[PDB]
Amino acid sequence: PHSMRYFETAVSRPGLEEPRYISVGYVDNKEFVRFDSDAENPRYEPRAPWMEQEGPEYWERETQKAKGQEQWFRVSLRNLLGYYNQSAGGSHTLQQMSGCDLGSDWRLLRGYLQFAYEGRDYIALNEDLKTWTAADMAAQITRRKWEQSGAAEHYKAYLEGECVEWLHRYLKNGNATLLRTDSPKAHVTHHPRSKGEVTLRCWALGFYPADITLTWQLNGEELTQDMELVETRPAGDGTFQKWASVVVPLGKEQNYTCRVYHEGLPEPLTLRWEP
């Protein structure tokens, strides 16, 4: 399964008439392009080594499309102020998600387009890419305005044509980097916890892609209801980390085994504390 997304954000700030506009491109969750209006020279830039394959004309046009986006987000933010009868003394946020998933069959699986106001659902394009979903009464004004204008037709054309097209391109170009795995470098550590109880940390480091699964076992039974599991975190080098800990009775640690599941791991790993 493969995807491309564009996460967009405009933030109106107290006093500044211009909103800050930030646009990030993702290809299979990997950031590949970025645009921040707060940069000294706001232009779309490569964020993945395979994007270097694109020429000045690609970057020139993207940047121009972005300045056009900047203006769309500003007026929208202004129109949104009136809909919810808000005072123009504070800051507000208008976010957008758009893109396309591809199935195991590199054919299209689904189009995506959804908006938000103040971090809350506003309006979204239905999967049929024809009808709109509003979240509240204010949204309905955009719904009725958009249904008429044929907006959905335009978004459909992008989400079924250009989204697909360039994703297929990015997938061929960034193949060597995108379809790679780094299997985890798991290990178990040992620490105190309470009176006559130690804790067992099962780490998994330096792994790509982000998806992973860590399990703990007592007497051949998974310890689901008794397991401290941190959310997955980036290392800052493109790989990811996760650990999982249980609280075990002291002197009975060897009873416990840690298991790791990753798509770069043909056989899942099995680990235990090593005194």
């Binding site: 986006q69 929208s76 129109n79 955009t142 958009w146 204008s149």
Partner: peptide, 9 residues
């Protein structure tokens, strides 16, 4: 490739 919004909110 980036997308451009056709109609205002």
């Amino acid at each position: 490739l980036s997308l451009r919004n056709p109609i205002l909110v």
